[PDB]
Amino acid sequence: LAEYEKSQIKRALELGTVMTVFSFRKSTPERRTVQVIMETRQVAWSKTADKIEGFLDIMEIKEIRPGKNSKDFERAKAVRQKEDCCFTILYGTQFVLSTLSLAADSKEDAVNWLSGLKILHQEAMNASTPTIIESWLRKQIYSVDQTRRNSISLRELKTILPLINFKVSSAKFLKDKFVEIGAHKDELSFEQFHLFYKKLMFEQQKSILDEFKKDSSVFILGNTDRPDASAVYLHDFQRFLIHEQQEHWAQDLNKVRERMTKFIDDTMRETAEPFLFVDEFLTYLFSRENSIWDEKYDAVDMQDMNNPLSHYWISSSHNTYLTGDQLRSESSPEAYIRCLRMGCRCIELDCWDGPDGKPVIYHGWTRTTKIKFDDVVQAIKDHAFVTSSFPVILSIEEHCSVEQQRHMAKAFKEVFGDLLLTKPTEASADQLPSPSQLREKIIIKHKKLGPRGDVKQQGELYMWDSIDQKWTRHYCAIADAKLSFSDDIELHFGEKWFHKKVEKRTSAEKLLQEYCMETGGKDGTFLVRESETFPNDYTLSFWRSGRVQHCRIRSTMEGGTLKYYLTDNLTFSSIYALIQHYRETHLRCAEFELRLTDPVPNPNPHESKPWYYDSLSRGEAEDMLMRIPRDGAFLIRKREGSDSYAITFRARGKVKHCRINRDGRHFVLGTSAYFESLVELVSYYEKHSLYRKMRLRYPVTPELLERYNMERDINSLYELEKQIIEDNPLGSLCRGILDLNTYNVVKAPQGKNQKSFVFILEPKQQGDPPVEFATDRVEELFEWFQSIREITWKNQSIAIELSDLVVYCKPTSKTKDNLENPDFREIRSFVETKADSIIRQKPVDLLKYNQKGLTRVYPKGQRVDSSNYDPFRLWLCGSQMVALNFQTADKYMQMNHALFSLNGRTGYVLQPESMRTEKYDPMPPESQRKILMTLTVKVLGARHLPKLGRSIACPFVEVEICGAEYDNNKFKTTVVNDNGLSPIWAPTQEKVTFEIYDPNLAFLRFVVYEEDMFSDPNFLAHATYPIKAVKSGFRSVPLKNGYSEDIELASLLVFCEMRPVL
Amino acid sequence: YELPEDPRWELPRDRLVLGKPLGEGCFGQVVLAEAIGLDKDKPNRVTKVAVKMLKSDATEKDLSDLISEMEMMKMIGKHKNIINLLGACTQDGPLYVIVEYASKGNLREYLQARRPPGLEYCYNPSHNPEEQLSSKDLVSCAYQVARGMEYLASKKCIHRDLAARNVLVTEDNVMKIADFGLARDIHHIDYYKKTTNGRLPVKWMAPEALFDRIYTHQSDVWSFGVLLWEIFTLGGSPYPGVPVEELFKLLKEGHRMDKPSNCTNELYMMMRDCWHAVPSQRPTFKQLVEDLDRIVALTSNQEYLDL
């Protein structure tokens, strides 16, 4: 396309157009204008041009697809809209991709839409770091208010520091920085903010560069590392790259010039020697182009794709349809789409019976939904090779009837044609072909005919508790004469302006005075109180434009009713009417014309809250905490002798006290989170977690405390506990385990507690409280009841066609545990327990089988939490189909992404030849182990760590070697306090030594954690890399969320030196 | 007998615990009791209330009288300056009337208990120097009572026994008219048989009600003037030393009680107005309300922003 053309494309995208928006939340679509914003690089959709309603980061857009092939267009509404005009965009940093579905008005507009979004995507991916910093600052500005303005005031800045995860130290150097940056009158033009922003980072983290220059080395920086901006010279810069960063392409100067030109991206800087400022040099050292990750592995290595397929680690996944836990997770084809676009090349289908005949997919005997098979295969084709054109392996855990397999295979062939593999590529060959030979082909893995040519109850149930007095849906399963269940599956008086008992007019005037001075100083702002002097009359004690005055709300009777009036000019019944009409329309006295702004809330509304105790000593609080068994319980108590508060709670079965202090009117938790009101504190922490993963769910009030004392026994989960976890089929989700032997169920005919179908446990020991599970369906109730009742007391299975379709990867259990006679056409399907047993027993034999044979490993059914297992050892022995759950995020999963990033995320990774040699052994003992490469790491500082909750992060970093047990070493970094955006790790702390025995497969893992008020590390971001891809020098690891998605500007500076052992 | 139930006022009997009786009339008794869950949003809240109940030897006419009394409270409504019905217990037990409770009793005894030193008939050990009522306090109390009669007359209520004994003081001192809405037959009430045995407030009535038994809102104004006299005599007995027999000739000769020592001239002329011989020229309660509010605004010596 021509560039003059691009101008119209972008400008059109910038002007925007009314565009029909679909989403699952609204059955009826909404006509809303959609326009792209370069300054934010966000495609926003809204009604009024002043405020943009929906945000959409262009970078997190993972793909753009045409047509109506998205989960949204099932409301049968866009059907009216033509196929061509409709499309949808998928985006986000979660395994489920949040979707924006659009319906156009004319085709050419739709084509231009998709074209512009694509081009913007490539440029954004190519965008220089300072430009995206500008876009991100602009995003913050757009966030602070929705008026899209280009200015910021002092107050917005201070409230914005938490947004950027940066704490103001004392608010007095902030005005000093204002003076320095030249901004005045507490206003910020966009560029003043940009410069102030740079100054903040540079002054905060200049010690980075202070160590950078160091000594005993090639001159890179001079002594002008003072906050004074200084230039980076092109010859000096190429000296730096050639020596410190050891870049081969840095030998040419013209490349260096091109790189500066791209990175600065300033049309003012057209000098023959473009110069980077010292602070700009910092931005470089944190920028993406200085990634530790070597670019050279991005180009899929073709010469490495000539080996037989037996010599490749493959991207495979375990029961991908599940977007979450193997149990109770929505299954959608978009899971498969996102899976393939990751770069997977082996995918699992557990097809079951088809209701009308067409089969479906759902995890066996669970409540995960059903999605039709034709859509599944259609999506497979439409995204099989688009990101990686190498062959894919669809695995079939067949479970349907013969006619349904016949239809399944017929659909296979009809929708795949030549794309499917239906004939061996090398008939006379005795080995697996090269992945190149199988390019643009689809392998079907599935049980074939036999050697001669011939072949528990689970559900969401109800919990009635006298303590909770409500029905809670808990997932339940039965096994081993016991049952397991999981956690839960899910107007004057009451208004803020009304303050009731206020001590005096002076007190209310004060309260409004501090409220105004700490923030939001307005003219005529009000406070509604009660007159201590005038009977039966309210009082609108009002600040007056830099002052505070007092005037009582006049009251008179009229029509037999209260006339909350005021000088007869205005009279109403509900205080709301006067308050509002005074807010918009100023009250007029012979003195002035002033309105009302702040309806301040009560000083201690928490008093009216039952969960709040007035004065509760520690020991008695502990007493009531130990009396109450439930976890999720909480109570707040005013600490005696001190204005500070305390919140007490039972978690893990341990009582814990947390002290909360107060600054101004805000209540501060620990040292970071500032909440206006205690009611706000509890309301927030109900929907989030405070300690571990516990959330404040159960209030502790005496009226419920008697009902606690009425019944105080709930059966509980009681590494022995982990043994119980692995024993029960519900795994780590089993909150409650109960021996069903001890109960003699009797079905409740009418049930109880306002539910249609319930049944009675009736324990053996009559004193034991019943439980009374309830169902949704009467037939479900009957099935469950009888279930517990017995608890108390040519072809055979595979259709010929599909079995003909399999040509490779044959499933054979005829050899059983014996590996003898490995043939190239077979697959071994292993479960992690038996796989690990084999690895411990006969690893060399596993290797020898592998170099000819195919080895597929999947996690056990006892991991219904979708938790990925430990598969590193499996690759060290060379296991080929290391199938995982992509919908989770565990250390091991990021190891998967690290390994399968290489070769252009094409899903294949050629095993090293040396490990393929006959002589080499997978598992070497201590004697044979010989250190191969030393690796020194010193992290220094970070940038833009995201924010988890309301608490501002106190970050530290763990750098470790994901690999073998001899390869396993960790290093923690001294945590810093209240420094999220621009943290400095100890410039004084030394470098750490790693010894690497097996470099060709070992992972560098940086992770960043934050120390909570309970001193508990939590997951912030990760970075996992194959050590073969590690570059040296001072490089910026770009940080990434748990779901293997990068986070804007997220990076840690680290100096890495890799010295091979000689 | 049987009583139809009204869901809006009916309160469970078991949620009310009776306590120490407060005062006994000729036919009915009133007790201080605790009601649980008077607020339907707060079922566990305990409220101190006054519960009226018939005597054990009560007759059917007294039962009808209490039925009428509760009904009159229901129709008149709610107002701060009157005693407000909270509910009734009519089913499965003796008829109980739950109304608001006044911790400080009627205003006569409350005022008498606050008389400054040198004014006491006998020494009061319970004298608190911090509770002494200024002139603003008396004018405010009078304003509150006047607002009460304005609410009652707005509901066409003639108190017929307006008296300082007949208005209670809340813990918040807020005046609340008591004993209003009493549809008490004027058949035969003796002038010479003291109260609690059936004496009319002869020292509280206007001549039209005294001679022709003409009870009106203007008789209410006359009795409220008597209230002002009592308040600025600090609960004083109307017509000190005047026999009831001589009251007829004194009022007929137009005689009126003197100026209270610590009472201003404006309020004194207000008392004269309330005690005008002709009821039609006597001022109506709304004008008394506005005049008393003006006197309050002048006495309270607090700035207010004339809008």
B306 in A contact zone (CB under 8 Å): yes
**Nearest CA-CA partner of A174 in A107, A270, B166, A183:** A183
B278 in A contact zone (CB under 8 Å): no
Question: What's the rounded Cα separation, in Å, for the pair A994 and A1057?
Answer: 10
Question: Residue B276 phi/psi, 5° resolution?
Answer: -70, 140
CA distance A609 to chain B (A): 12
Cβ-defined contact of B307 to A535 (cutoff 8 Å): no
For A242, the enclosing helix (H) or strand (E) is: helix A234-243
**Nearest CA-CA partner of B191 in B199, B179, B183, B203:** B199
Region of A161 (left: φ > 0; alpha: ψ -120 to 50; beta: rest) is alpha
How long is chain B?
Answer: 307
| Same domain flag for A813 and A910 | yes
**Nearest CA-CA partner of A1022 in A942, A907, A940:** A942
After which residues are there C–N gaps above 2.5 Å in chain A?
455, 490, 718, 793
Cβ-defined contact of B305 to A703 (cutoff 8 Å): no
Range of the domain at A952: 933-1060
CA distance A552 to chain B (A): 8
Contacts with A49 (C-beta within 8 Å, 6 or more apart), sequence order: A33
For B34, the enclosing helix (H) or strand (E) is: strand B28-36
Q: Round the CA-based radius of gyration of chain A to a whole number and report it.
A: 33
A793-797 contacts, C-beta under 8 A, 24 or more apart: A794/A453, A794/A454, A795/A402, A795/A449, A795/A454, A795/A455, A796/A454, A796/A455, A797/A402, A797/A455
Cβ-defined contact of A569 to B307 (cutoff 8 Å): yes
B101 assigned binding-site residue: yes
Question: What's the rounded Cα separation, in Å, for the pair A72 and A100?
Answer: 8
| Same domain flag for A68 and A118 | yes
Cβ-defined contact of B307 to A567 (cutoff 8 Å): yes
| Same domain flag for A814 and A882 | yes
CATH number reported for the structural domain that contains residue A654 in this entry: 3.30.505.10
Dump the DSSP string for A167-190. --SSSHHHHHHHHHHT--TTEEEH
Is residue B213 classed as helix, strand or coil in its secondary structure? coil
CA A862 to chain centre: 24
- Which tokens in the block code for residue A960? 């470790």
Cβ-defined contact of B174 to A536 (cutoff 8 Å): yes
For A455, the enclosing helix (H) or strand (E) is: none
Distances in whole angstroms, Cα of residue A480 to Cα of each of A327, A382, A719, A727, A789: 19, 45, 21, 9, 14
Scan for tokens 């307006």, then name that residue: B162
CA A869 to chain centre: 20
Dump the DSSP string for A790-805. HHH---SSS-HHHHHH
Could you tell me if A952 and A937 are in contact, meaning their C-beta atoms sit under 8 angstroms apart? no
Pairing of strands A346-349, A392-396: parallel
Residue type, A990: E
Residue type, B64: S
> Count of alpha carbons within 13 Å of B104, Cβ hemisphere only?
19
CA A976 to chain centre: 24
A611-616 contacts, C-beta under 8 A, 24 or more apart: A611/A635, A611/A636, A611/A682, A611/A699, A611/A700, A611/A701, A612/A636, A612/A637, A612/A678, A613/A637, A613/A638, A614/A638, A615/A640
**Nearest CA-CA partner of A321 in A258, A281, A251, A372:** A372
CATH-assigned architecture of domain B16-100: 2-Layer Sandwich (3.30)
Cβ-defined contact of B144 to A535 (cutoff 8 Å): yes
Question: What's the rounded Cα separation, in Å, for the pair B166 and B182?
Answer: 12
Contacts of A535 in chain B (CB under 8 A): 140, 143-144, 174
Is residue A724 classed as helix, strand or coil in its secondary structure? helix
B304 in A contact zone (CB under 8 Å): yes
Question: What's the rounded Cα separation, in Å, for the pair A633 and A275?
Answer: 60
Dump the DSSP string for A125-180. HH--HHHHHHHHHHHHHHHH-TT--SEEEHHHHHHHHHHTTB--SSSHHHHHHHHH
CA distance A174 to chain B (A): 41
- Which tokens in the block code for residue A618? 């520690």
For A225, the enclosing helix (H) or strand (E) is: none
The β-bridge partners of A22 are A101
Question: What's the rounded Cα separation, in Å, for the pair A264 and A915?
Answer: 45
Question: What's the rounded Cα separation, in Å, for the pair A468 and A753?
Answer: 12
Nearest by CB: B307 against A556, A560, A566: A566
Query: Residue A134: inside a domain, yes or no?
Result: no
The β-bridge partners of A556 are A563
Sheet of A555-558: strand order equals A555-558, A561-566, A570-572
Scan for tokens 């385990």, then name that residue: A737
Dihedral over Cα of A223, A225, A228, A233: its sign: positive
Region of A67 (left: φ > 0; alpha: ψ -120 to 50; beta: rest) is left
For B272, the enclosing helix (H) or strand (E) is: helix B265-274
B302 in A contact zone (CB under 8 Å): yes
Widest distance between CA atoms in chain B: 60
Nearest by CB: A589 against B147, B174, B305: B305
B82 in A contact zone (CB under 8 Å): no
DSSP A54: B
The β-bridge partners of A593 are A588
Question: What's the rounded Cα separation, in Å, for the pair B11 and B47?
Answer: 13
Query: Residue A131: inside a domain, yes or no?
Result: no
Buried b (16+ CB within 10 A) or exposed e, B194-232: eeeeeebbbbbbbbbbbeeeebbbbbbbbbbbbbbbbbb
Residues of chain B with CATH 1.10.510.10: 107-295
- Which tokens in the block code for residue A856? 């597929």
| Same domain flag for A12 and A122 | yes
Contacts with A192 (C-beta within 8 Å, 6 or more apart), sequence order: A181, A182, A183
Query: Residue A720: inside a domain, yes or no?
Result: yes
The active-site residue, picked from A318, A446, A606, A897, is A318
Contacts of B44 in chain A (CB under 8 A): 703
For B140, nearest residue in chain A (alpha carbons): A535
Could you tell me if A878 and A846 are in contact, meaning their C-beta atoms sit under 8 angstroms apart? yes
Angle between helical axes of A129-144 and A278-286 (0-180°, round to 10): 90
B176 in A contact zone (CB under 8 Å): no
For A588, nearest residue in chain B (alpha carbons): B307
Cβ-defined contact of A557 to B300 (cutoff 8 Å): no
B41 in A contact zone (CB under 8 Å): no
Contacts with A652 (C-beta within 8 Å, 6 or more apart), sequence order: A631, A692
Could you tell me if B183 and B69 are in contact, meaning their C-beta atoms sit under 8 angstroms apart? yes
Distances in whole angstroms, Cα of residue A625 to Cα of each of A611, A646, A656, A701: 13, 13, 9, 11
The active-site residue, picked from B14, B62, B161, B220, is B161
CA distance A776 to chain B (A): 32
Residue type, A978: D
Question: What's the rounded Cα separation, in Å, for the pair B58 and B28?
Answer: 8
For A531, nearest residue in chain B (alpha carbons): B302
B52 assigned binding-site residue: yes
- Count Cβ atoms within 10 A of the Cβ of residue A973 and give its class: 0-12 exposed, 13-18 middle, 19 or more buried: buried
Pairing of strands B16-24, A351-352: unpaired
Residues of chain B with CATH 3.30.200.20: 16-100
Question: What's the rounded Cα separation, in Å, for the pair A375 and A355?
Answer: 15
Could you tell me if A1022 and A1042 are in contact, meaning their C-beta atoms sit under 8 angstroms apart? yes
For B21, the enclosing helix (H) or strand (E) is: strand B16-24
Contacts of B143 in chain A (CB under 8 A): 535
Could you tell me if B231 and B293 are in contact, meaning their C-beta atoms sit under 8 angstroms apart? no
Pairing of strands A471-479, A458-464: antiparallel
Query: Residue A751: inside a domain, yes or no?
Result: yes
Cβ-defined contact of A557 to B77 (cutoff 8 Å): no
CATH number reported for the structural domain that contains residue A906 in this entry: 3.20.20.190
Query: Residue A137: inside a domain, yes or no?
Result: no
Q: Is A499 a catalytic residue?
A: no
- Which tokens in the block code for residue B157? 């209520």
Dihedral over Cα of A839, A844, A845, A848: its sign: positive
CATH number reported for the structural domain that contains residue A57 in this entry: 2.30.29.30
Dihedral over Cα of A338, A341, A344, A346: its sign: positive
Classify domain B107-295 at the CATH class level: mainly alpha
Could you tell me if B65 and B25 are in contact, meaning their C-beta atoms sit under 8 angstroms apart? no
Q: Round the CA-based radius of gyration of chain B to a whole number and report it.
A: 20
Domain stops at, among A734, A757, A792: A792
B165 assigned binding-site residue: yes
**Nearest CA-CA partner of A658 in A319, A1012, A305, A399:** A1012
The β-bridge partners of A774 are A462, A758
Domain stops at, among A863, A889, A916: A916
- Which tokens in the block code for residue A886? 């992509």
Resolution in angstrom units: 4.1
The β-bridge partners of A276 are A232
Contacts with B204 (C-beta within 8 Å, 6 or more apart), sequence order: B161, B162, B163, B222, B223, B226, B238
Dump the DSSP string for B213-281. ----HHHHHHHHHHHHHHHHTTSPPSSTT--HHHHHHHHHTT------TT--HHHHHHHHHHT-SSTTT
B236 assigned binding-site residue: no
B174 in A contact zone (CB under 8 Å): yes
Other Cβ atoms less than 10 A from the Cβ of B9: the count is 17
Other Cβ atoms less than 10 A from the Cβ of B298: the count is 11
| Same domain flag for A464 and A385 | no
Contacts of A509 in chain B (CB under 8 A): none
Pairing of strands A881-884, A854-858: parallel
Question: What's the rounded Cα separation, in Å, for the pair A518 and A513?
Answer: 9
For A814, the enclosing helix (H) or strand (E) is: none
Other Cβ atoms less than 10 A from the Cβ of A656: the count is 15
Sheet of A371-372: strand order equals A351-352, A360-361, A371-372
Cβ-defined contact of B44 to A703 (cutoff 8 Å): yes
Distances in whole angstroms, Cα of residue A922 to Cα of each of A101, A310, A852, A928, A1004: 50, 16, 16, 11, 21
| Same domain flag for A152 and A227 | yes
Residues 211-250 of B with CB under 8 A from A: none
Interface test with B, best of A505, A536, A608, A609 (most B CBs within 10 A): A536
Interface test with A, best of B175, B299, B302, B307 (most A CBs within 10 A): B307
Within A963-1029, strands assigned E span 970-972, 992-996, 1003-1011, 1017-1026
For A542, nearest residue in chain B (alpha carbons): B305
Could you tell me if B303 and A533 are in contact, meaning their C-beta atoms sit under 8 angstroms apart? no
How many contacts does A have with B, using Cβ atoms within 8 A? 40
- Which tokens in the block code for residue A767? 């004193």
Question: What's the rounded Cα separation, in Å, for the pair A311 and A309?
Answer: 5
CA distance B135 to chain A (A): 13
**Nearest CA-CA partner of B262 in B229, B221, B291, B238:** B229
Query: Residue A599: inside a domain, yes or no?
Result: no
| Same domain flag for A395 and A483 | no
Cβ-based interface (< 8 Å): residues of A facing B: 533-536, 549, 551-552, 556-557, 559-560, 566-567, 569, 587-591, 703
Contacts of B304 in chain A (CB under 8 A): 551-552
Scan for tokens 């349907």, then name that residue: A400
Question: Residue A722 phi/psi, 5° resolution?
Answer: -65, -35
**Nearest CA-CA partner of A592 in A542, A521, A519, A552:** A542
Domain stops at, among A792, A812, A842: A792
Cβ-defined contact of B147 to A551 (cutoff 8 Å): no
Question: What's the rounded Cα separation, in Å, for the pair A999 and A1002?
Answer: 5
**Nearest CA-CA partner of B41 in A612, A493, A500, A636:** A493
Question: Residue B237 phi/psi, 5° resolution?
Answer: -75, 125
How long is chain A?
Answer: 1062
Query: Residue A495: inside a domain, yes or no?
Result: no
Question: What's the rounded Cα separation, in Å, for the pair B83 and B170?
Answer: 10
Query: Residue A707: inside a domain, yes or no?
Result: no
Residue type, A234: L
Could you tell me if B279 and B219 are in contact, meaning their C-beta atoms sit under 8 angstroms apart? yes
Instruction: For Cα atoms A621, A622, A625, give the angle at the middle one, nearest 5 degrees.
Output: 90
| Same domain flag for A446 and A465 | no
> What's the total number of domains in chain A?
7
Question: Residue A917 phi/psi, 5° resolution?
Answer: -70, 150
Could you tell me if A68 and A78 are in contact, meaning their C-beta atoms sit under 8 angstroms apart? yes
- Which tokens in the block code for residue B56? 């054990």
B154 in A contact zone (CB under 8 Å): yes
The β-bridge partners of B32 are B50
DSSP A324: S
Could you tell me if A348 and A397 are in contact, meaning their C-beta atoms sit under 8 angstroms apart? yes
